[PDB]
Amino acid sequence: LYWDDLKRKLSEKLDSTDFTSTIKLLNENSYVPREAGSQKDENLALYVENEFREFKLSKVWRDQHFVKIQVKDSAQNSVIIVDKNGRLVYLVENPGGYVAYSKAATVTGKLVHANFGTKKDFEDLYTPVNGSIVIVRAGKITFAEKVANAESLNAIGVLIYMDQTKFPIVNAELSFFGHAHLGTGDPYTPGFPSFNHTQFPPSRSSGLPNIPVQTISRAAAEKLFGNMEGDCPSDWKTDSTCRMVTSESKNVKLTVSNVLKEIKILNIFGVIKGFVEPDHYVVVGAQRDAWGPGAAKSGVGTALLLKLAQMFSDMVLKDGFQPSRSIIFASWSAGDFGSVGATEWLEGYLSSLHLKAFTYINLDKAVLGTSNFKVSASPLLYTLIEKTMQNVKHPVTGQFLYQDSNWASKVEKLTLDNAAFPFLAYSGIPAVSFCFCEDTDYPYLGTTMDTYKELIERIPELNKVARAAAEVAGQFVIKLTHDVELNLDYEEYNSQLLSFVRDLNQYRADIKEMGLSLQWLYSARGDFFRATSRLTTDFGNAEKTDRFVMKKLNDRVMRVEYHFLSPYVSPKESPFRHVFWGSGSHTLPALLENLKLRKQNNGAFNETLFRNQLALATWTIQGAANALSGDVWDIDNEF
């Protein structure tokens, strides 16, 4: 069949699927407080597993894992205002929720208020946090980062609250759940999978806080500010009530007693074997666990995952759809702790997944509103996101998703808190991640209020919306399979690479003071450009009939993304090796970020570090080229 056919079919199928029901079903007490590794968790897990079986799809299995999660100890965690001795006022509060992987300790001192988790940026404010507890708003960044920065400035203890402006929740006595791990997955099995506790049981600090972090209710925040002299700025796009520093007269004490708890995570798979490249998959995932009932955090996703798997299987058996490449749906678990489920899976194919999975879609938090349509992905999926937003019509507005007034659409970078991030920054798999987002992030998100009710009370046509999300997700799959040519934008990296070279040339001056020639970089950038130009040519000259010549090409395409992961850094040390989207000194952005410091004439600039950064970052790109063809044995022997 042809695209129109698949597009049309997939639509009517989407026209007759109740997503709202399943989003509700995944709310019955049968599986409501489906915490990570809980019974409910395991309940829904088997539900999905069976549903897949019922869907009559091909092979479907389970993925067991034992990771260390952190939970609230029997001893109560609390915040209390107290002078250089005893609590005068009252125990601010005994927080109802907590920040996982938080340093298990208790300390007291001054209490500064660095708007939006310091943002790392905001830390450049007047009052110093040099040895004092800090308050921050839940927002622009992730707790992990908020805390990380706080501690990088030598602070201790961090409180996170949901202000009124950012979080318009009527109830101010509401508490939410946190993360705190500056990474992805179990924080003791970096790059390699985990085992028992009995075996390989290190404690922590392997990329974990080392500073107590506690989530606080707005109400509690109110009271804290009540005992603070300083006055909150207008710079902070907030609203009155907060201070900046506690009234000297007295300080505050934070006490968090949390304990590690080995649980058994259960990932559930299920594929749909392809017909020509049966061994090249399109991983479609969806977080299944959640702290509260997580109708949004986990409902909509799993809801889509199921309904979406139900369709393709059907299409394959009844409608004649013959996906040239297999599809593999996966419902991860222990996701509230950093995609621990999906990550440790990847951890499992540390150097082969890219040979198998060529793209990872992600349905998490797919429906959160009806205004915007945020989209984050690897440039390799740029044109797919585009052309698809040109085929899918907004659920509310009768118009298409794509803003016809531009030629350059907006695509966001994947964040440390998105299961898709690991797939791309660690496993080198290109990944997309859409969201029918809103200017303001869903409030009830990390709290017990993520109910199917308060959701649909806030998004009336949730069905139509989820449908759309299920449609863009569907087309991605049809598209990434329908045709024999693996359609990934390996060109977009030329641009991505040129942009770097450009930004780097703004320091040609600094580059000159240092003996650096910066010539080898251009060569790489070019040696790579050709590589793509050949591939982009060889394709055109090859016939969509020679299963062999095509397979040889598609494989080259399939290498592109993975090969941009620094082959000079160990996964065990720095898991996000992707020079473009990773995190670490190997990061391309990180290079400029160090060089910028050169001008500051201070010591902030580590020259030896740069020298290497450039040196390697060059050979990384270079290699990416020699790997992406050049007909092998690239013959630019001159230079």
527 binds, among Sm ion, ligand NAG, a copy of itself, none (CB under 5 to 8 A by kind): Sm ion
Is residue 609 at the binding interface for ligand NAG, with CB under 6 A as the rule? yes
- Write the Ramachandran bin of 532: left for phi over 0, alpha for psi from -120 to 50, otherwise beta: alpha
Residue 351 in the binding site for a copy of itself (CB under 8 A): yes
Distance, CA of 455 to CA of 294 (rounded, Å): 10
Asked whether the beta carbons of 172 and 136 are under 8 A apart, the reply is: no
Q: Cβ of residue 519: shortest distance to ligand NAG, in angstroms?
A: 5
Applying the rule CB under 8 A, the residues between 64 and 123 that interact with a copy of itself are 64
Q: Which does 186 bind (CB under 5 to 8 A by kind): Sm ion, ligand NAG, a copy of itself, none?
A: Sm ion
Residue with tokens 């501690």: 151
Instruction: Determine, following the binding rule CB under 6 A, whether residue 517 of this chain makes contact with ligand NAG.
Output: yes
- State the number of binding residues for a copy of itself (CB under 8 A): 57
Q: In sequence order, what are the residues at sequence separation of 6 or more whose Cβ sits closer than 8 angstroms to the Cβ of residue 535?
A: 490, 553, 556, 557, 628, 629
Cβ count within 10 A of residue 320: 11
Query: Rounded to the nearest whole angstrom, what is the least distance from the CB of residue 262 to ligand NAG in the complex?
Result: 7
Given a copy of itself, ligand NAG, Sm ion, none, residue 638, with its beta carbon under 5 to 8 Å by kind, binds a copy of itself
Q: How far is the CB of 437 from a copy of itself (least distance, A)?
A: 32
In the shown chain, the binding pattern of residues 51 to 70 toward ligand NAG, with x for contact by CB under 6 A and - for none, equals ---------------x----
Choosing from 204, 264, 356, 596, the residue that interacts with a copy of itself (CB under 8 A) is 356
Residue among 460, 440, 445 at smallest CA distance from 372: 440
Considering only residues 16, 85, 196, 600, which one is a binding residue for ligand NAG as defined by CB under 6 A?
A: 196
Looking at 152, 351, 440, 519, which residue binds ligand NAG (CB under 6 A)? 519
Taking the complex as a whole, how short is the minimal distance between the CB of residue 62 and a copy of itself, in angstroms? 5
Residue 580 in tokens: 């473009």
Residue 202 binds ligand NAG (CB under 6 A)? no
Cα–Cα distances in Å, from 509 out to 184, 417, 611? Answer: 38, 37, 15
Residue 602 binds ligand NAG (CB under 6 A): no
| Cα separations in angstroms, 142 against 71, 160, 162, 168 | 19, 11, 13, 19
Q: How many residues does the chain have?
A: 639
Question: Which of 345, 527, 582, 614 is close enough to bind Sm ion by CB under 5 A?
Answer: 527
516 binds a copy of itself (CB under 8 A): yes
Q: Are 629 and 557 in contact (CB under 8 A)?
A: no
Q: Is 512 in the site for a copy of itself (CB under 8 A)?
A: no
Interface with ligand NAG includes 206 (CB under 6 A)? no
Report the alpha-carbon distance of residue 31 to residue 302 in Å, rounded.
13
**Position of tokens 């399943």?**
22
Partner interacting with residue 606 (select from ligand NAG, a copy of itself, Sm ion, none; CB below 5-8 Å by kind): ligand NAG
294 forms part of the interface with Sm ion (CB under 5 A): no
Judge whether 122 and 114 are in contact, CB under 8 Å.
Answer: yes
Is 605 one of the binding residues for a copy of itself (CB under 8 A)? no
Work out how close the CB of 612 gets to ligand NAG at its nearest, in angstroms, rounded to a whole number.
6
Strands 271-272 and 325-330: what pairing?
A: antiparallel
For position 637 contacting ligand NAG by CB under 6 A, the verdict is no
- 59 touches a copy of itself by CB under 8 A: yes
Q: Are 376 and 411 in contact (CB under 8 A)?
A: yes
Strands 78-82 and 251-256, how do they pair? antiparallel
For residue 198, state whether it binds ligand NAG (rule: CB under 6 A).
yes
Report the residue number, 85 or 198, with the smaller CB distance to ligand NAG. 198
Which stretches of 427-514 are assigned E, i.e. beta strand?
432-435
Nearer to Sm ion, 134 or 524 (CB): 524
For the record, the structure tokens of 99 come out as 């920040």
Q: H helices within 143-275, ranges in order?
A: 143-152, 218-226
| Residue 444-483 contact track with a copy of itself, rule CB under 8 A, x = bound | ----------------------------------------
Closest Cα partner for 488 from 570, 401, 564?
A: 564
CA distance 201 to 194: 10
Residue with Cβ nearer ligand NAG (107 or 172): 107
Which residue, 520, 420, 480, is CA-closest to 277?
Answer: 480
CA pair distance 113, 236, nearest whole angstrom? 11
Name the amino acid, one letter, at 24: K
| Spatial distance between the Cα atoms of 514 and 187, rounded to a whole number of angstroms | 39
Provide Rg for the chain, Cα atoms. 25
Among 195, 248, 440, 460, which residue sits at the site for a copy of itself (rule: CB under 8 A)? 195
547 lines the binding site for a copy of itself (CB under 8 A)? yes
Segment contacting Sm ion (CB under 5 A): 133-141, 174-182, 478-486, 522-530?
522-530
Binding flag, residue 364, Sm ion (CB under 5 A): no
Please give the residue whose beta carbon sits closest to ligand NAG in the complex. 131
Distance, in Å, from the CA atom of 135 to the CA atom of 213, rounded to the nearest integer, reads: 10
- Position 573 contacts Sm ion (CB under 5 A): no
Judged by the rule CB under 6 A, the positions of this chain that interact with ligand NAG are: 66, 130-131, 196, 198, 517, 519, 606, 608-609
Judged by the rule CB under 8 A, the positions of this chain that interact with a copy of itself are: 59, 61-64, 191-193, 195-196, 198-200, 269, 271, 279, 281, 328, 348-352, 355-356, 515-517, 520, 547-548, 551-552, 559, 563, 567-573, 611, 615-616, 619, 622-623, 626-627, 631-633, 635, 637-639
